[PDB]
Amino acid sequence: DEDETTALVCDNGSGLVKAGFAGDDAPRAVFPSIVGRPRHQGVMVGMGQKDSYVGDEAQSKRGILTLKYPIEHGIITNWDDMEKIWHHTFYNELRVAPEEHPTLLTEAPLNPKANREKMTQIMFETFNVPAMYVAIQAVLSLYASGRTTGIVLDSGDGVTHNVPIYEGYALPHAIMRLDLAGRDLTDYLMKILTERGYSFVTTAEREIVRDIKEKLCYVALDFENEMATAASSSSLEKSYELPDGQVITIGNERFRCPETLFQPSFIGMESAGIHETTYNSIMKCDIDIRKDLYANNVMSGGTTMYPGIADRMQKEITALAPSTMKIKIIAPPERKYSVWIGGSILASLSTFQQMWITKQEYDEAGPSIVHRKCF
Amino acid sequence: DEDETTALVCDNGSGLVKAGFAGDDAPRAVFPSIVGRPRHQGVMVGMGQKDSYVGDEAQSKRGILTLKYPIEHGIITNWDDMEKIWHHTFYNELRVAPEEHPTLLTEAPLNPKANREKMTQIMFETFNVPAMYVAIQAVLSLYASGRTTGIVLDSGDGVTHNVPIYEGYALPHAIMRLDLAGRDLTDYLMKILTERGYSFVTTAEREIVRDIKEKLCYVALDFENEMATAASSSSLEKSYELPDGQVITIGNERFRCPETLFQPSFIGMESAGIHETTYNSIMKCDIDIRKDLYANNVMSGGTTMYPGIADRMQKEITALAPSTMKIKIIAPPERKYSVWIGGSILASLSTFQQMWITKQEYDEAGPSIVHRKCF
Amino acid sequence: DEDETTALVCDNGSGLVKAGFAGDDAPRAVFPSIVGRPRHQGVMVGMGQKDSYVGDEAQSKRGILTLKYPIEHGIITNWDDMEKIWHHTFYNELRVAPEEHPTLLTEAPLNPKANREKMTQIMFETFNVPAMYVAIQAVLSLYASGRTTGIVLDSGDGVTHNVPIYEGYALPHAIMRLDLAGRDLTDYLMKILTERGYSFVTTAEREIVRDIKEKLCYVALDFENEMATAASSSSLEKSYELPDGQVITIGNERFRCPETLFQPSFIGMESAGIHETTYNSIMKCDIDIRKDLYANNVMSGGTTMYPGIADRMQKEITALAPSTMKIKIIAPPERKYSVWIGGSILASLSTFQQMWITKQEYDEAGPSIVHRKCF
Amino acid sequence: LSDKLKEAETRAEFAERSVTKLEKSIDDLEDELYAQKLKYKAISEELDHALNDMTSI
Amino acid sequence: LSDKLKEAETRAEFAERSVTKLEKSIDDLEDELYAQKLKYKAISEELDHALNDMTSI
């Protein structure tokens, strides 16, 4: 509920969409970035049944639906599905019509430009939003974390960008984009669970493995030591109950999934991992910047939920990092929600009300305008 | 905050800015002559952020700034950045306002006249100082050291002046203005540290090297012997800790840099070194002058603080000089900051209160007046 | 397979290696400075398969190899990998044993001492070369161009050294070492091609972008006007064919890349560009030297093959230079092969036979000898 | 041949551009030589005409 | 491509002759400019010299 024409804020990834009203500390609605479609022939009539299902509808009726998402490795590929997600999120759950509210959408700085143009176009042409702005995900993560300086390691579902910012300024030459994210970690787990005798390939099955990953996995402070024990003893297996009452137990696979973050070679990627990019983004920053970024490396986005990741990352960076200097990783509670929270912080600033593209400038120029007006 | 209209005294050089009030025995504060500017695009909103930073602000936020020095080897060219340096020096440090105090600034005897005219113009037109006086650095150097007769060896960051003064009179035909200074040593050290595998090319790197030089360097009494051992053993090496935690170990570069003062050919300069210029400035004077000048070679400015510098120059001058006669270097602890002290001495003399340009004479004549009123 | 005991010429850089026999006009063995290694688990047996691949082998089998460069920013960081490049270049392609062929290697004037001594050591202890020499690329560039005077802009993959020579003598105080090179231009292009929807990060991708740059990029004489049309119309776009049959179409990125040479801030570098450094290499030399260096601005090495660069530079230096003065660029079609050609000229010169360090002097003094004997 | 053509086209285009640069530089030299003669012999020859009068008296 | 190459190469080599012809003409115009500058200089200076010598009388 809202009693003022505040800006709307909405973070959109390949995982989930978080939305709410600017000025709060949390989204008021969160939906999966999913549009579902039936793959069966109907026989009964007078059954209702939709052509397409969105967000929670897509998951609730998923037993006979194929589930697809609109965003791939940071970009929108299906604008029509994003319009459905935002239509449902804004009008049915948040009960707000964007026509009366400015809207803030987000992306990291290296995100292909088509994404910013589509975010701008959908809100101006299908929602008639009076104003738009596309913000940097690293900017919003630092606002949420209480920082102006730090490196944002946005280990989300799609892509990780690891963007360094100092005194509120971009250091773009040092952004070390990485082709490793939560969606790939799910795929690793599906293959290793197949080795254990449980094949997961269809939509319902893919959703189960994603759910297993989120609830059972952890990074492991020491991979080899954790594996030496997990591979030898059943006492480290965690039992997950499958939707049909059957169970699956997961042992060292429980940590080998997130280990891909430290071992991308697990999914065929030519990279050492998220700690390597954390290190390279700071390594390329000015010598008089480094000390402030090393003491403030920032976790943002999801996959940061791993109760093994907090110590695993600081150990891995400290090992590469300079002596004398304090090396530290910030792993705030505003995790998995930091971009939305930062969005609220930015959207509600008085200093940000001059940053909006109006629905005047938009129609005169078209959506390419976002490329000149936002950053 | 002062309870008297004491003159303000400031040495605004290519290196440091020294300031305090007339009548004291030291500058109250010393900081670099730096105005810094962001070299990056801002991305966070509501971050404050200046267009330019001054002095210690410029160094404190330097991680994203390019840093410039308005004074070029003794002359002021970027008067706008110097207005900011003076405003900071006076109001944020000394807590004085030139409007309520006469002001004394200083320059070398063969410094281009443009420097004295521009300093006079700005203090009268932008700070509304009631009076001005551009002093000679050589005059101030001997006042601080306690001599009416001697050679001023002001070997600081900008230029080495080399001027003989006898009984308070200039002997100008014997001035050996030399383009060899502490500023060249910083850049030379960056190049020889590059030879060791530690390249330095940027502002941050230059400020790091200036710090290495100021803390690790010396000249030594016997260069070749010091060189032979430094080049052969770790026993003459000294480490330095960089701002980012890197450690550089420096050997004969520790003195090979500073040695450029005696061997200018190291930086491509056509010069016999500071000891020969001292020697010749005396040899060009009458024989009833030389007896007093050789016994009173007086150090002022930076680089005079290097171990072995007074002994190194005295040895070389003595070797070039005739026997029977005594050759001596005066090198008091009030080094590098002694010209400021001399400014305090001059500003406070009763015999100097008729030497001021007032803000009447100034407006009637314009800033060129300094050329006739000061000396 | 050669008919004379002629020294080899091997211009081994951070990019490619041009090798051949002294006395000729061209290299005979041209390889990338690449050592490749498999990053996959084998399934078939009896497949041969090397631990490492070099030069053309590294590129031919690159589909599953990670490719590394043993040389970075002008120096060898991995000498074991250079022994592998050298063994192949010498024995398989040039088909010569160094034992009877002294071999000339190249370096930049301010290149770290460690690199010049390590190159000397490998050729004497691993290849048993009878003698060694390490040459200055600027010397070689001037011989190839028919000059003893000029500014050599050796603008290759590693470092741009900006080094002046007059009447065959070095003018080292005026060398402007610059941390901007062809490798950075490739990285910049990968980042702006990401903006267009084509991210490039892996070895295959890194090699593709370097090939795109070499084939499609240019500077022209006016960036802003070229950008105004490239950013507005498909008429300035050029398509590049990717190895799998897919294509990438590139617009203003085509010139924005190499423009970093004139705008280093594009990669976060604190520099005014290559024309400022060329200018300072001329300007920092004596006034009676400047006229000859202005008239002999010499293009050498890589990046000199960007369309419009020889004239772009003459224009940009002219813009900084005094009027009346003639600024001239030397830019023959033998561009970039001029270092190799000079290596041939110098190595075979009768006046330079005494400049070779023999494998007598080498063992008595050790590899540091190169520092005292070559120049 | 496609590459030889692109290269020859680069050379043709190079030569068209080089020619263009030289079309500009020939005209600049045609105009600079013109201007220098037009102002130099016209002024200095005029100065020698003035010599005819300057050195009279 | 063989025909397009022959044209690109022919046009390139021809245009390269236009490059060398314009370039040569530029150098010749510059030698003329120089000579013109030299004569200008020599005349103005000969007159200024002689005039300085002959300012008086």
Any idea where the domains of chain C sit in the sequence? 4-34+71-134+337-371, 35-68, 136-181+271-332, 182-267
Beta partners for residue A249, in sequence order:
A239
Contact C100, C130 (CB under 8 A): yes
A37 φ, ψ (degrees, to nearest 5):
-140, 140
Quote the CA–CA distance of A194 and A202 in Å, as a whole number: 13
Architecture of domain B35-68: Roll (2.30)
Please list every residue in chain D whose beta carbon sits closer than 8 Å to the beta carbon of residue C311. Answer: 21
Taking the C-alpha atoms of B312, B317, B323 and B326 in order, what is their torsion angle to the nearest 10 degrees?
-80
The answer to whether the CB of B201 falls within 8 A of the CB of C277 is: no
Query: How many CB atoms are closer than 10 A to CB B53?
Result: 22
C329 three-class SS: strand
Nearest CA-CA distance, residue D52 and chain E, Å: 11
Q: Using only C-alpha atoms, what is the Rg of chain A?
A: 21
Chain B residues near residue A166 by CB distance under 8 angstroms: 40, 63-64
Residue type, B162: N
Residue where the block lists tokens 């669970």: A193
A299's tokens: 């976790």
For A158, the token pair is 């799609």
How many beta-carbon contacts under 8 Å exist across B and C?
33
> What is the biggest distance separating any 2 CA atoms in chain E, rounded to whole angstroms?
79
**D43 to chain E, minimum CA–CA distance in Å?**
8
Look up residue C4 and give its DSSP letter. Answer: S
- Asked if C270 lies within 8 A of B39 by C-beta distance, the reply is yes
Contacts of A258 (CB under 8 A, 6+ apart): A185, A217, A218, A219, A220, A303, A306, A308, A309
Give CA–CA dist C114/C366, Å, rounded.
13
Q: Which residue has 């290149």 as its token pair? A: C111
E to B contact (≥3 Cβ pairs closer than 8 Å): no
Distance (Å, rounded) from C-alpha A152 to C-alpha B286? 72
Query: Which pair of tokens denotes residue C124?
Result: 């004497």
| CA-CA-CA-CA dihedral for B49, B50, B55, B57, to nearest 10 | -10
Are both A4-34+71-134+337-371 and A182-267 of the same fold? no
Amino acid at B256: R
Q: What is chain C's alpha carbon radius of gyration, rounded to the nearest angstrom?
A: 21
> How far apart, in whole angstroms, are the C-alpha atoms of residue A350 and residue A345?
10
Q: What amino acid occupies position A250?
A: I
DSSP state of B356: P
Q: C149, C178, C148: which is closest to C303 by C-alpha?
A: C178
DSSP B7: P
Say how far apart CA A116 and CA A339 lie, in whole Å: 16
Residue B253 neighbours by CB under 8 Å, 6+ apart: B189, B192, B193, B195, B196
Continuous H helices in B130-249: 137-145, 182-195, 203-216, 223-230
C-alpha closest to that of B200 among C270, C72, C186, A174: C270
Nearest by CB to E15, which of D16, D43, D55?
D16
Which of C123, C51, C59 is closest to C87 using CA atoms? C123
**Distance between CA atoms of B259 and B303, rounded to whole angstroms?**
10
Q: How far apart are CA B73 and CA B70, in angstroms?
A: 10
3-state SS class at C107: strand
Number of helices followed by number of strands (H, E) in chain D: 1, 0
Residue with tokens 């084509």: C198
β-pairing, B150-153 vs B297-299, is parallel
CB distance B204 to B139 below 8 Å: no
Give Cα separations from A24 to A145, A148, A344, B45 (angstroms). Answer: 15, 20, 6, 18
- The number of residues making up chain A comes to 375
The alpha helices in chain B, defined as continuous H runs, are: 56-60, 79-87, 113-125, 137-145, 182-195, 203-216, 223-230, 253-256, 274-283, 287-293, 309-320, 338-347, 361-365, 370-373
Between CA C162 and CA C259 the distance in angstroms is 18
Reference B250, options B282, B209, B290; nearest CA is B209
Measured distance CA(C170)–CA(A58) in Å, rounded:
74
Q: Which residues of B touch A (CB under 8 A)?
A: 38, 40-47, 49, 61-64, 202, 204-205, 207-208, 241-247
Secondary structure of chain A in HEC code, one letter for each residue: CCCCCCCEEEEECCCEEEEEECCCCCCCEEEECCEEEECCCCCCCCCCCCCCEECHHHHHCHHHEEEECCEECCEECCHHHHHHHHHHHHHHHCCCCHHHCCEEEEECCCCCCHHHHHHHHHHHHCCCCCEEEEEEHHHHHHHHHCCCCEEEEECCCCCECCEEEECCEECHHHCCCECCCHHHHHHHHHHHHHHCCCCCCCHHHHHHHHHHHHHHCCCCCCHHHHHHHHCCCHHHCEEEECCCCCEEEECCHHHHCHHHHCCHHHHCCCCCCHHHHHHHHHHCCCCCCHHHHHCCEEEECCCCCCCCHHHHHHHHHHCCCCCCCCCCEECCCCCCCHHHHHHHHHHCCHHHCCCCEECCHHHHHCHHHHHHHCC
Contacts of A353 by beta carbon, 8 Å cutoff, 6+ apart: none
Residue to substitute from E47, E51, E54, E57, interface D, most D β-carbons within 10 A = E47
Q: How many CB atoms lie within 10 A of CB B241?
A: 15
Cα angle B87-B90-B92, degrees, rounded to a multiple of 5: 80
Query: A133 forms bridges with which residues in the sheet?
Result: A104
Q: Which two tokens stand for residue A365?
A: 């120029």
Bridge partner residues of A32 (DSSP)? A16
| Residues of D engaging C, defined by a Cβ cutoff of 8 Å | 10, 14, 17, 21
Q: Which residues of D touch E30 (CB under 8 A)?
A: 29, 33
Bridge partner residues of A136 (DSSP): A107
d(CA A247, CA A302) in angstroms, rounded, equals 26
Cβ–Cβ < 8 Å for C280, C176: yes
Reference A189, options A212, A156, A160; nearest CA is A212
In 3D space, the residue among A109, A36, A118, A107 whose CA is nearest the CA of residue A77 turns out to be A118
The answer to whether the CB of B162 falls within 8 A of the CB of B133 is no
Instruction: Give the contacts of A276 (CB within 8 A, at least 6 positions apart).
Output: none
Question: Which member of A168, A289, A352 has the closest CB to residue B63?
Answer: A289
Best residue of B195, B198, B209 to probe chain C, by most C CBs closer than 10 Å: B195
Q: From B76, B83, B71, select the one nearest B122 (Cα to Cα).
A: B83
Q: Do C307 and D21 touch (CB under 8 A)?
A: no
Distance between CA atoms of residues B17 and B27, nearest Å: 9
- The contacts of residue A19 (CB under 8 Å, 6+ apart) are A8, A9, A10, A11, A27, A28, A29, A30, A31, A86, A89, A90, A93, A94, A340
**Torsion angle (degrees, nearest 10) of CA B93, B97, B103, B105:** 40
Position D3: which residue type?
D
Distance between CA atoms of residues A302 and B318, nearest Å: 75
For B357, list phi and psi in degrees, rounded to 5. Answer: -85, 125
* Long-range contacts of A352-360, Cβ-Cβ distance < 8 Å, separation of 24 or more: A352/A133, A352/B45, A352/B46, A355/A133, A355/B45, A356/A102, A356/A131, A356/A132, A356/A133, A357/A120, A357/A131, A357/A132, A357/A133, A358/A130, A358/A131, A359/A124, A359/A128, A359/A129, A359/A130, A359/A131, A359/A132
The token pair at C230 is 């490239």
Q: Which residue carries 């940027």 as its tokens?
A: B202
* Residue B64 in tokens: 């994203």
Residue whose tokens read 């006042």 = B143
- What fold is seen in the domain A136-181+271-332? Nucleotidyltransferase; domain 5 (3.30.420)
d(CA C159, CA C161): 6
Q: Mark A263-295 as b/e (b = at least 16 C-beta within 10 Å).
A: bbebeebbbbbbbbbbbbbbebbbbbbbbbbbb
Q: Which chains touch C (3 or more CB pairs under 8 A)?
A: A, B, D
Cβ–Cβ < 8 Å for A356, A133: yes
Q: Decide: B152 and B124 in contact? Cβ < 8 Å.
A: no
Contact E18, D12 (CB under 8 A): no
Grouping H, G, I as helix, E, B as strand and the rest as coil, residue B36 is strand
Rounded Cα–Cα distance for residues E10 and C108 (Å): 40
Amino acid at position B109, single letter: P
- DSSP E strands in E1-57: the ranges are none
Residue C241 host element (H or E): strand C238-241
Chain B contacts of C163, Cβ < 8 Å? none
DSSP state string for B308-321: THHHHHHHHHHHHS
Residues B102, B128: Cα–Cα separation, whole Å: 10
Angle at A190 between CA A189 and CA A195, to 5 degrees: 90
CA B247 to chain centre: 29
Verify whether the Cβ–Cβ distance A114 to C197 is below 8 Å.
yes
Q: Which H or E element spans position C250?
A: strand C247-250
Q: Supply φ then ψ for residue C217, to 5 degrees.
A: -85, 155
Q: Which letter does DSSP use for residue B93 in this model?
A: I
Rounded Cα distance between C179 and C371, Å, is: 23
Please indicate the experimental technique that yielded this structure: cryo-EM
Q: Residue C300 burial by CB count (10 A; 0-12/13-18/19+): exposed, middle or buried?
A: buried
Report the CATH fold assignment for C182-267.
Answer: Actin; Chain A, domain 4 (3.90.640)
Chain B residues closer than 8 Å to C179 by CB: 199, 201-202
Long-range contact set of residues B356-362: C-beta below 8 Å, sequence gap at least 24: B356/B102, B356/B131, B356/B132, B356/B133, B357/B120, B357/B131, B357/B132, B357/B133, B358/B130, B358/B131, B359/B124, B359/B128, B359/B129, B359/B130, B359/B131, B362/B120, B362/B124, B362/B132
How many Å apart are CA A9 and CA A211, to the nearest integer?
26
With contact defined as beta carbons under 8 Å apart, do A183 and A68 qualify? no
Q: How far is B102 from B104, CA to CA, in rounded Å? A: 7
Taking contacts as CB-CB distances below 8 angstroms, the residues of chain C near B195 are: 110, 112-113
Give me the helices (H) in C126-222, please.
137-145, 182-195, 203-216
Who's near B308: CB < 8 A, 6+ residues apart? B218, B219, B220, B221
The CATH H-level superfamily of B4-34+71-134+337-371 is ATPase, nucleotide binding domain (3.30.420.40)
CB B244 within 8 A of CB A325: yes
Run of H or E including B90: none
Residues from chain E contacting residue D44 (CB–CB below 8 Å): 39-40, 43-44, 47
